[PDB]
Amino acid sequence: QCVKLNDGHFMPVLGFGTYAPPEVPRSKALEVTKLAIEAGFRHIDSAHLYNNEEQVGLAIRSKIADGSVKREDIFYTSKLWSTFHRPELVRPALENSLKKAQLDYVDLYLIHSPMSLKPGEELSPTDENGKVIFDIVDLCTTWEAMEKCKDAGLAKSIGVSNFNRRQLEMILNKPGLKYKPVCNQVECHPYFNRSKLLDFCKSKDIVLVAYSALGSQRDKRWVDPNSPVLLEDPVLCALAKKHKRTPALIALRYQLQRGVVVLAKSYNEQRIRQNVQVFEFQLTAEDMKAIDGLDRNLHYFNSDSFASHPNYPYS
Ligand SMILES: NC(=O)c1ccc[n+]([C@@H]2O[C@H](COP(=O)([O-])OP(=O)(O)OC[C@H]3O[C@@H](n4cnc5c(N)ncnc54)[C@H](OP(=O)(O)O)[C@@H]3O)[C@@H](O)[C@H]2O)c1
Ligand SMILES: O=C(O)c1ccccc1Nc1cccc(C(F)(F)F)c1
Ligand SMILES: O=C(O)c1ccccc1Nc1cccc(C(F)(F)F)c1
Structure with missing residues (x-):
């Protein structure tokens, strides 16, 4: 239930998403x-x-203290926020995250986004129009x-998030590169399946x-309400009925069968327990072809505040 990363560490192929909005x-x-x-x-x-x-x-x-798991059984990820891309701010940002979580190390630390923002107090610093104040940093x-x-042991593995092929290539071609990114965490689902980026990542041993x-x-704040609701997709529905699972389970299993590590956020006890059933069934080649056919270049995160950034990953 794990994949071997390019630095020798192991990552469980199903992960729990923890983001919930401020409300x-x-x-x-x-x-x-x-x-x-x-x-x-x-x-x-x-x-x-x-x-x-x-x-x-x-x-x-x-869960460690009550004996349910050991620290070594948990793979914990945090991410460097975009106001901290300037190199002198990276280690302090990681140390802050470790202090917050009261952990000695993170298993994985990611650059959250290639879209550098002005260093300071704000998470999302703004001008007048609500557009973000960007920063220009050599990533x-x-x-x-x-x-x-990584060398200091604060992170077992390091990687990136929201990088496109070119941005990833720039890191990979860096003179004197010590460690490749182990992964690129990106928006990925049947409406935006990232086939070409996945092929590229596979070619470089990046998850x-x-x-x-x-x-x-x-x-x-970032998603058009008009965008199609993935879990109401008729094809995913038909597949869920065929296998007597749910559309969510079909969507997760799709990723695993393509060699993609998949995250799933739920703050509902029933759905959290449901999502681990991804390991209990398989999709056929014809099922996978049907899901592949859903691709419509749809990134849900689709706001002027991202799209205007000079390092915006999408074309
Ligand atoms: N690197 C990045 O820039 C970035 C960006 C976005 C997300 N992420 C990470 O990826 C995680 C997941 O992505 P996401 O936050 O966009 O959410 P998601 O995994 O796509 O889930 C979307 C919604 O699906 C619902 N859901 C979960 N299981 C379900 C099921 N079995 N049946 C029906 N509905 C179900 C959840 O609602 P309920 O809670 O009501 O169950 C959730 O709000 C995040 O929490 C975060 O850790 C990273
Ligand atoms: O094991 C990998 O390298 C892997 C990588 C990405 C996505 C899924 C992966 N493996 C996978 C996919 C389905 C079921 C199981 C397992 F049987 F181990 F649970 C493992
Ligand atoms: O990481 C999350 O879950 C997230 C939550 C809320 C808002 C943005 C988020 N991620 C994020 C942060 C910065 C840039 C991009 C993207 F590249 F997709 F635009 C995505």
């Missing part, structure tokens, strides 16, 4: 992360951006700082990790 009480992350571990999730995905690392960390530490220098964090695999949380 959800912070205490919920503690409750649901414990439930996720109880259900069998061993890969837990968080970030500085999520304002939940204390709660998620506490959940992990609670190869950021990567060097990430490498130093593609899918987020919004269930169609995203459809947050009004």
